[PDB]
């Protein structure tokens, strides 16, 4: 049992499970965001098969066995005239980290505090942050938040013999 | 023309990955 729901800008909510043709869900350890791809059937030749429209930058939710696994924004949209299909590409919220670009001056700071400050500067909600009592000192000029956090946690990993991810 | 389609797909994938952020 998989369900897909779409929230449109005006306030309408649709359940589009009966129209979906294919679903894909994937991630990699070298990027902070996960991706979701799906297709629906919409025919312009036939009046019966015309569907609703889902504009760019609307929220899509993915459920499996009554559990929410994905929530993200619609980024790409494509329509082929030969085939009766419309394709969508969605991305997690995690790509918001790489948009930020700030300059910091860190002296003898805990890595957890560094991550907390980076998340707080560009306003973002924090669920939980791994704890490590390793102090770091660095000067960041023109670097992403994602790169800042990853560099600090790599320096912590040089001592904890661990690996970390966002 | 196969090379053109392959290049188009590769370019689209690289652009999506750039938007998503790569470490």
């Amino acid at each position: 049992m998989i369900k897909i729901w779409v929230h449109i800008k005006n306030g309408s909510i649709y359940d589009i499970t009966d129209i979906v043709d294919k679903v894909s869900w994937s991630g990699d350890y070298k990027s902070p965001s996960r991706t979701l791809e799906f297709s629906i059937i919409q025919s312009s030749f036939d009046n019966v098969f015309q569907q609703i429209d889902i504009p760019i930058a609307s929220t899509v939710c993915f459920y499996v066995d009554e559990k929410e696994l994905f929530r993200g924004m619609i980024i790409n949209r494509s329509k082929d005239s030969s085939s009766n299909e419309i394709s969508f590409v969605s991305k997690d919220m995690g790509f918001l980290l790489t948009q930020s670009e700030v300059s910091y001056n860190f002296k003898d700071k805990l890595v957890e505090d560094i991550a907390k400050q980076v998340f707080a500067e560009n306003r973002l909600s924090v669920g939980i942050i791994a704890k490590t009592n390793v102090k770091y000192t660095k000067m960041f000029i023109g670097v992403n938040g994602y790169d800042t956090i990853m560099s600090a946690y790599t320096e912590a990993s040089k001592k904890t013999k661990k690996k970390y991810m966002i | 023309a196969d090379i053109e389609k392959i290049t188009s797909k590769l370019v689209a994938s690289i652009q999506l990955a750039q938007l998503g952020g790569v470490l």
């Binding site: 929230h7 909510i13 459920y63 973002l124 909600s125 | -």
Partner: protein, 134 residues
């Protein structure tokens, strides 16, 4: 403080647990006189299959496109067959289709079969079997 990067508000993303359909209940009806039934100075409420009988009776009795209050899917088209507008076989097939499609819109009804069909004089007889969740 923190931004919400999704369309709407956090309240719209709470999903109520999906449960079985609530028990089907309806006001009792008197088929012989075509009236609702009063009990102890109030309407009498019946449950499960009796309510389904009331709903099926009312659905079969109405015409499909006659009334403005109803949508285009409510009612039956059995009035188009009166007077032998089609041959006997075509009328039989169309009657079966009309009854099935009219009844199947209720989510509490699972399948419908029209099995026996006989023409005697000016009367058409049929047997209908309905399967529900109960």
């Amino acid at each position: 403080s923190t931004i919400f990067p999704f369309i709407g508000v956090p309240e719209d993303y709470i999903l109520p647990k999906t449960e079985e359909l609530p028990i089907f209940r309806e006001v009792a009806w008197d088929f012989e006189k075509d009236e609702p039934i009063l009990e102890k100075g109030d309407f009498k409420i019946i449950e499960k299959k009796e309510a389904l009988k009331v709903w099926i009776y009312k659905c079969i009795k109405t015409n499909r496109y006659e009334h403005e209050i109803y949508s285009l899917e409510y009612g039956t088209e059995l009035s188009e067959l009166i007077g032998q507008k089609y041959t006997k076989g075509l009328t039989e097939s169309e009657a079966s289709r009309f009854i099935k499609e009219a009844l199947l819109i209720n989510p509490y009804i699972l399948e419908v079969n029209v099995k026996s069909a006989n023409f005697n004089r000016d009367i058409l007889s049929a047997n209908v079997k309905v399967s529900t969740i109960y």
